[PDB]
Amino acid sequence: GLRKEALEELMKLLNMKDFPYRIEGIDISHTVASLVVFEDGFPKKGDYRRYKIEQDDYESIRTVVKRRYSKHPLPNLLFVDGGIGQVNAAIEALKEIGKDCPVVGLAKKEETVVFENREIHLPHDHPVLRLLVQIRDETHRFAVSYHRESLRSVLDNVPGIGPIRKKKLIEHFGSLENIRSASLEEIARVIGSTEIARRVLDIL
Structure with missing residues (x-):
């Protein structure tokens, strides 16, 4: 001002x-x-x-x-x-x-x-x-x-997810900071799997 x-x-x-x-x-x-x-x-x-x-x-x-x-x-x-x-x-x-x-x-x-x-x-x-x-x-x-590329590059290290679900998680969360401080239950809902959402949190 x-x-x-x-x-x-x-x-x-x-x-x-x-x-x-x-x-x-x-x-x-x-x-x-x-x-x-x-x-x-x-x-x-x-x-x-x-x-x-x-x-x-x-x-x-x-x-x-x-x-x-x-x-x-x-x-x-x-x-x-x-x-x-x-x-x-x-x-x-x-x-x-x-x-x-x-x-x-x-x-x-x-x-x-x-x-x-x-x-x-x-x-x-x-x-x-x-x-x-x-x-x-x-x-x-x-x-x-x-x-306001980082989330994308890192999610490349996450096996068995694919280009579709990747862009879902990028859309809903936008950043590494938001996906990391999210609960397991929420991430599961964005992609349709506790097992993959567990792997995502585990790897990130």
């Missing part, structure tokens, strides 16, 4: 014409773009989106930015992860579609904000620096849920 006065401070620091009421943040992971949304500093999780890019994070940002803003309104401010390059990719993409929107990021150099090809140094606890870091970390927190 971003402080509203820190939003005002970001506006002043960057000389923006408009208050950053809506901010969107983008991360590239290896390719998926993860897009997050803050509205008046509140994360709007129902507005988050993920983009698959078939194919250079530079190029991935450029692609995602053109794709998204050809269908959606511009935010008041766009934050991109990775530093100068990814900010430049976003800007280039915006030009190519004839759109106008401030883009900010964080250089790989410590305590450095990237804005309009300028680098602004801010001390560690400066509220604008803290705010930007909050945004970046939220992009990352969202990205790590594109991985």
Whole structure:
């Protein structure tokens, strides 16, 4: 949750014409773009989106930015992860579609904000620096849920079960953590056998 006065401070620091009421943040992971949304500093999780890019994070940002803003309104401010390059990719993409929107990021150099090809140094606890870091970390927190394979690989070691019942137990339980802390009686019901459910708990 971003402080509203820190939003005002970001506006002043960057000389923006408009208050950053809506901010969107983008991360590239290896390719998926993860897009997050803050509205008046509140994360709007129902507005988050993920983009698959078939194919250079530079190029991935450029692609995602053109794709998204050809269908959606511009935010008041766009934050991109990775530093100068990814900010430049976003800007280039915006030009190519004839759109106008401030883009900010964080250089790989410590305590450095990237804005309009300028680098602004801010001390560690400066509220604008803290705010930007909050945004970046939220992009990352969202990205790590594109991985919430382990249960599958391990259940491969369980003899005499087969591809059908495997996907049942993956569907009902989803993870190794849930299947392991489940009772014998429940697992039996998902697959139709105490003897196999016993073997599953035994082996896991």
